[PDB]
PDB file of all heavy atoms in Angstrom:
ATOM      1  N   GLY S  34      -3.449  -7.972   1.274  1.00 15.69           N
ATOM      2  CA  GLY S  34      -3.060  -8.538  -0.032  1.00 15.69           C
ATOM      3  C   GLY S  34      -4.247  -8.822  -0.948  1.00 15.69           C
ATOM      4  O   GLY S  34      -5.402  -8.659  -0.552  1.00 15.69           O
ATOM      5  N   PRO S  35      -3.969  -9.248  -2.204  1.00 16.82           N
ATOM      6  CA  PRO S  35      -4.997  -9.423  -3.232  1.00 16.82           C
ATOM      7  C   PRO S  35      -5.646 -10.811  -3.266  1.00 16.82           C
ATOM      8  O   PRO S  35      -6.466 -11.005  -4.070  1.00 16.82           O
ATOM      9  CB  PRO S  35      -4.206  -9.198  -4.523  1.00 16.82           C
ATOM     10  CG  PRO S  35      -2.824  -9.711  -4.213  1.00 16.82           C
ATOM     11  CD  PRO S  35      -2.628  -9.548  -2.718  1.00 16.82           C
ATOM     12  N   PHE S  36      -5.264 -11.732  -2.385  1.00 15.50           N
ATOM     13  CA  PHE S  36      -5.805 -13.107  -2.384  1.00 15.50           C
ATOM     14  C   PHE S  36      -6.992 -13.188  -1.419  1.00 15.50           C
ATOM     15  O   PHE S  36      -6.780 -13.560  -0.257  1.00 15.50           O
ATOM     16  CB  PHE S  36      -4.696 -14.104  -2.037  1.00 15.50           C
ATOM     17  CG  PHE S  36      -3.482 -14.046  -2.930  1.00 15.50           C
ATOM     18  CD1 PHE S  36      -2.320 -13.430  -2.500  1.00 15.50           C
ATOM     19  CD2 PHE S  36      -3.488 -14.625  -4.193  1.00 15.50           C
ATOM     20  CE1 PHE S  36      -1.199 -13.370  -3.316  1.00 15.50           C
ATOM     21  CE2 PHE S  36      -2.370 -14.569  -5.007  1.00 15.50           C
ATOM     22  CZ  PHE S  36      -1.227 -13.940  -4.568  1.00 15.50           C
ATOM     23  N   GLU S  37      -8.202 -12.918  -1.918  1.00 17.27           N
ATOM     24  CA  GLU S  37      -9.479 -12.944  -1.155  1.00 17.27           C
ATOM     25  C   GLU S  37      -9.644 -14.225  -0.340  1.00 17.27           C
ATOM     26  O   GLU S  37     -10.260 -14.147   0.745  1.00 17.27           O
ATOM     27  CB  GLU S  37     -10.707 -12.913  -2.057  1.00 17.27           C
ATOM     28  CG  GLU S  37     -10.734 -11.726  -2.969  1.00 17.27           C
ATOM     29  CD  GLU S  37     -12.143 -11.343  -3.373  1.00 17.27           C
ATOM     30  OE1 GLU S  37     -13.024 -12.251  -3.361  1.00 17.27           O
ATOM     31  OE2 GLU S  37     -12.352 -10.146  -3.681  1.00 17.27           O
ATOM     32  N   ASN S  38      -9.215 -15.371  -0.873  1.00 18.85           N
ATOM     33  CA  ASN S  38      -9.448 -16.690  -0.234  1.00 18.85           C
ATOM     34  C   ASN S  38      -8.612 -16.784   1.049  1.00 18.85           C
ATOM     35  O   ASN S  38      -8.939 -17.621   1.873  1.00 18.85           O
ATOM     36  CB  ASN S  38      -9.237 -17.866  -1.199  1.00 18.85           C
ATOM     37  CG  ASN S  38     -10.158 -17.833  -2.408  1.00 18.85           C
ATOM     38  OD1 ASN S  38      -9.995 -18.613  -3.342  1.00 18.85           O
ATOM     39  ND2 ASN S  38     -11.128 -16.931  -2.433  1.00 18.85           N
ATOM     40  N   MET S  39      -7.591 -15.952   1.248  1.00 21.88           N
ATOM     41  CA  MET S  39      -6.838 -15.957   2.529  1.00 21.88           C
ATOM     42  C   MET S  39      -7.474 -15.041   3.592  1.00 21.88           C
ATOM     43  O   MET S  39      -7.090 -15.174   4.758  1.00 21.88           O
ATOM     44  CB  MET S  39      -5.396 -15.527   2.307  1.00 21.88           C
ATOM     45  CG  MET S  39      -4.644 -16.507   1.453  1.00 21.88           C
ATOM     46  SD  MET S  39      -2.970 -15.961   1.201  1.00 21.88           S
ATOM     47  CE  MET S  39      -2.325 -16.252   2.853  1.00 21.88           C
ATOM     48  N   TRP S  40      -8.390 -14.131   3.242  1.00 20.96           N
ATOM     49  CA  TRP S  40      -8.858 -13.104   4.211  1.00 20.96           C
ATOM     50  C   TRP S  40      -9.620 -13.744   5.370  1.00 20.96           C
ATOM     51  O   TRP S  40      -9.455 -13.303   6.499  1.00 20.96           O
ATOM     52  CB  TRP S  40      -9.667 -12.011   3.522  1.00 20.96           C
ATOM     53  CG  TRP S  40      -8.909 -11.239   2.491  1.00 20.96           C
ATOM     54  CD1 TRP S  40      -7.555 -11.136   2.348  1.00 20.96           C
ATOM     55  CD2 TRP S  40      -9.483 -10.452   1.437  1.00 20.96           C
ATOM     56  NE1 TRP S  40      -7.250 -10.336   1.275  1.00 20.96           N
ATOM     57  CE2 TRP S  40      -8.414  -9.912   0.690  1.00 20.96           C
ATOM     58  CE3 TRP S  40     -10.791 -10.183   1.031  1.00 20.96           C
ATOM     59  CZ2 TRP S  40      -8.624  -9.121  -0.435  1.00 20.96           C
ATOM     60  CZ3 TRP S  40     -11.001  -9.385  -0.076  1.00 20.96           C
ATOM     61  CH2 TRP S  40      -9.932  -8.856  -0.793  1.00 20.96           C
ATOM     62  N   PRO S  41     -10.485 -14.773   5.181  1.00 20.00           N
ATOM     63  CA  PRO S  41     -11.120 -15.440   6.320  1.00 20.00           C
ATOM     64  C   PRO S  41     -10.114 -15.985   7.337  1.00 20.00           C
ATOM     65  O   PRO S  41     -10.319 -15.782   8.530  1.00 20.00           O
ATOM     66  CB  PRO S  41     -11.904 -16.587   5.680  1.00 20.00           C
ATOM     67  CG  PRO S  41     -12.243 -16.033   4.313  1.00 20.00           C
ATOM     68  CD  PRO S  41     -10.983 -15.291   3.900  1.00 20.00           C
ATOM     69  N   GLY S  42      -9.071 -16.656   6.840  1.00 18.07           N
ATOM     70  CA  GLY S  42      -8.041 -17.286   7.679  1.00 18.07           C
ATOM     71  C   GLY S  42      -7.268 -16.227   8.440  1.00 18.07           C
ATOM     72  O   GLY S  42      -6.952 -16.446   9.625  1.00 18.07           O
ATOM     73  N   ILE S  43      -6.987 -15.106   7.777  1.00 15.28           N
ATOM     74  CA  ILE S  43      -6.309 -13.935   8.392  1.00 15.28           C
ATOM     75  C   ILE S  43      -7.165 -13.436   9.557  1.00 15.28           C
ATOM     76  O   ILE S  43      -6.611 -13.144  10.634  1.00 15.28           O
ATOM     77  CB  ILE S  43      -6.052 -12.853   7.334  1.00 15.28           C
ATOM     78  CG1 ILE S  43      -4.937 -13.285   6.382  1.00 15.28           C
ATOM     79  CG2 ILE S  43      -5.744 -11.506   7.975  1.00 15.28           C
ATOM     80  CD1 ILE S  43      -4.767 -12.368   5.192  1.00 15.28           C
ATOM     81  N   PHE S  44      -8.476 -13.335   9.364  1.00 13.16           N
ATOM     82  CA  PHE S  44      -9.383 -12.858  10.433  1.00 13.16           C
ATOM     83  C   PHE S  44      -9.395 -13.854  11.594  1.00 13.16           C
ATOM     84  O   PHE S  44      -9.324 -13.404  12.739  1.00 13.16           O
ATOM     85  CB  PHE S  44     -10.794 -12.627   9.911  1.00 13.16           C
ATOM     86  CG  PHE S  44     -11.701 -12.061  10.965  1.00 13.16           C
ATOM     87  CD1 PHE S  44     -11.603 -10.730  11.330  1.00 13.16           C
ATOM     88  CD2 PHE S  44     -12.656 -12.852  11.577  1.00 13.16           C
ATOM     89  CE1 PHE S  44     -12.432 -10.203  12.308  1.00 13.16           C
ATOM     90  CE2 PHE S  44     -13.503 -12.320  12.541  1.00 13.16           C
ATOM     91  CZ  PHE S  44     -13.386 -10.996  12.910  1.00 13.16           C
ATOM     92  N   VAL S  45      -9.532 -15.154  11.321  1.00 16.32           N
ATOM     93  CA  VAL S  45      -9.621 -16.191  12.388  1.00 16.32           C
ATOM     94  C   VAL S  45      -8.318 -16.165  13.194  1.00 16.32           C
ATOM     95  O   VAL S  45      -8.380 -16.173  14.436  1.00 16.32           O
ATOM     96  CB  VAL S  45      -9.884 -17.590  11.812  1.00 16.32           C
ATOM     97  CG1 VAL S  45      -9.710 -18.659  12.886  1.00 16.32           C
ATOM     98  CG2 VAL S  45     -11.266 -17.685  11.184  1.00 16.32           C
ATOM     99  N   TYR S  46      -7.187 -16.152  12.499  1.00 16.11           N
ATOM    100  CA  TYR S  46      -5.839 -15.992  13.096  1.00 16.11           C
ATOM    101  C   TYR S  46      -5.841 -14.825  14.081  1.00 16.11           C
ATOM    102  O   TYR S  46      -5.253 -14.966  15.178  1.00 16.11           O
ATOM    103  CB  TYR S  46      -4.788 -15.752  12.014  1.00 16.11           C
ATOM    104  CG  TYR S  46      -3.393 -15.594  12.539  1.00 16.11           C
ATOM    105  CD1 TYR S  46      -2.582 -16.686  12.801  1.00 16.11           C
ATOM    106  CD2 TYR S  46      -2.880 -14.336  12.784  1.00 16.11           C
ATOM    107  CE1 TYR S  46      -1.289 -16.530  13.283  1.00 16.11           C
ATOM    108  CE2 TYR S  46      -1.599 -14.165  13.269  1.00 16.11           C
ATOM    109  CZ  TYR S  46      -0.794 -15.262  13.509  1.00 16.11           C
ATOM    110  OH  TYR S  46       0.466 -15.044  13.987  1.00 16.11           O
TER     111      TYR S  46
END
Side-chain angles (χ1 to χ4, degrees):
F36 304 103
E37 303 206 334
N38 300 171
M39 295 179 72
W40 298 341
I43 288 171
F44 184 76
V45 169
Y46 181 85

